[PDB]
């Protein structure tokens, strides 16, 4: 019966930043809103109560202000420790609690180019009747990126997946797996296999290829 | 000081029953609501309901009302959540959780938390992965793809753990078969691809799999 709405899905800042998240409340809550803190993987830490208190052994610079329907969590000075997902919390339904869709904080750097990889299957997996075609951005920064299939120069859509590594704690850049999956019918059909990379690191697209068959 | 230790994870059928436990210790069970949260994979947080652990009295979200049981067992300090009849789309990550909330309201954050129960529900059966490689060809990459494994996790490792540096081993997805597919990848001198060698090991543990791949230039 309260609708939480947390206003910038993800924020990119650098340490010694100033950071606001706002939440919003789509009926009155009072002061009754709590923000936690969640890492990857991790279990969600209890930042600020009641809008504004500290949480006992929390560091100073988180503060939360707001009554009502607005509020907002502040990091007046942003340490590497505290990248990580942010959720607000009203306790004030009595009918439900109810969480924001959170925000995740990331660390913003110097943009970087990713370098590009393109894997042909292996002759084990074709004997099998399958063959999986893997493309592989490295260490790039925005996590933003677009990886394009052709095979013999026609898009392929939906029949592909991929994966993002967390952000990397040294370099702060994200990684990038995408595997195209063929049958050995299909895949012994054409020959020319390409992953085009749009990234805006890259004044124009890169593509990586390999003709089938070809050392 | 104050703890929640929950059971571990779990990994079951479409139409099986589940029980899950989150065990306190370091204050009174009695005197605090224990909440439970989901969160499904790759999503934000929902409350389930909550129960005071002293009579079991109970409060459920609407949209989880006569789909779960929270119960608790005050003697040894624990509380449980349960389905009857579980779907696919109950899998997430399950969190208990304890109401700092005394009388009514007045505050009620969720204070301390536990790590989290992982539950799978799939009509999957379990699988050892097949491990194929990524060959090589300044800086090269090279890597294996563990596919077609079910339920998680899979650990890689290089070169029996002595090659870390430059090691990306990526989140798996899950493919329309319901088998989980991961690749793990590194970068390397260029120079050293004829004289270095390069072997991923991977272990499965649900399947009893170890593997050794050596990745070599084609």
């Known amino acids: 019966d309260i609708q939480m709405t947390q206003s910038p899905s993800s924020l990119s800042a650098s340490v010694g930043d100033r950071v606001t998240i706002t939440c919003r409340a789509s009926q009155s809550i009072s002061s009754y809103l709590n923000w936690y803190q969640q890492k990857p993987g991790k279990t969600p830490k209890l930042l600020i109560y009641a809008a504004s208190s500290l949480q006992s052994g929390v560091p100073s610079r988180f503060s939360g202000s707001g009554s009502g329907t607005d509020f907002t969590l502040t990091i007046s000075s942003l340490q590497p420790e505290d990248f990580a997902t942010y959720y607000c919390?009203?306790?004030?339904?009595?009918?439900?609690?109810?969480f924001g869709q959170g925000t995740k904080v990331e660390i913003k750097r110097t943009v970087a180019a990713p370098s590009v990889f393109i894997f042909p299957p292996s002759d084990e997996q074709l004997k099998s009747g399958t063959a999986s075609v893997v493309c592989l951005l490295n260490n790039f920064y925005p996590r933003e990126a677009k990886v394009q299939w052709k095979v013999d120069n026609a898009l392929q859509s939906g029949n592909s997946q991929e994966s993002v590594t967390e952000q990397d704690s040294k370099d702060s850049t994200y990684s990038l797996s995408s595997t195209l999956t063929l049958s050995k019918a299909d895949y012994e059909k054409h020959k020319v296999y390409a992953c085009e990379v749009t990234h805006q690191g890259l004044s124009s697209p890169v593509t990586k290829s390999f003709n089938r068959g070809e050392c | 000081e104050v703890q929640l230790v929950q059971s571990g994870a779990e990994v079951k059928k479409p139409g099986e029953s589940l029980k899950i436990s989150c065990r306190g210790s370091?204050?009174?069970?009695?005197?605090?609501?224990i909440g439970w949260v989901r969160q499904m994979p790759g999503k934000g947080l929902e409350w389930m309901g909550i129960?005071?652990?002293?009579?079991?009295?109970?409060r459920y979200s609407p949209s989880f009302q006569g789909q779960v049981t929270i119960s608790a067992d005050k003697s040894i300090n624990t509380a449980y959540l349960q389905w009857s009849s579980l779907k696919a789309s109950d899998t997430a990550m399950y969190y208990c959780?304890?109401?700092?909330?005394?009388?009514?309201?007045?505050?009620?954050?969720?204070?301390?938390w536990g790590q989290g129960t992982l539950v799978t529900v799939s009509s999957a059966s379990t699988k050892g992965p097949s491990v194929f490689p990524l060959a090589p060809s300044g800086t090269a990459a090279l890597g294996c793809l563990v596919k077609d494994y079910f339920p998680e996790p899979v650990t890689v490792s290089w070169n029996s753990g002595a090659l870390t540096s430059g090691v990306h081993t990526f989140p798996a997805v899950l493919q329309s078969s319901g088998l989980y597919s991961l690749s793990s990848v590194v970068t390397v001198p260029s120079s050293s691809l004829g004289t270095q060698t390069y072997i991923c090991n991977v272990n499965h543990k649900p399947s009893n799999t170890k593997v050794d791949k050596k990745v070599e230039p084609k």
């Open positions: 370091g204050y009174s069970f009695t005197s605090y609501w």
């Open positions: 129960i005071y652990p002293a009579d079991s009295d109970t």
């Open positions: 959780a304890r109401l700092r909330m005394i009388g009514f309201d007045k505050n009620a954050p969720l204070d301390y």
């Open positions: 919390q009203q306790s004030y339904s009595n009918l439900m609690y109810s």
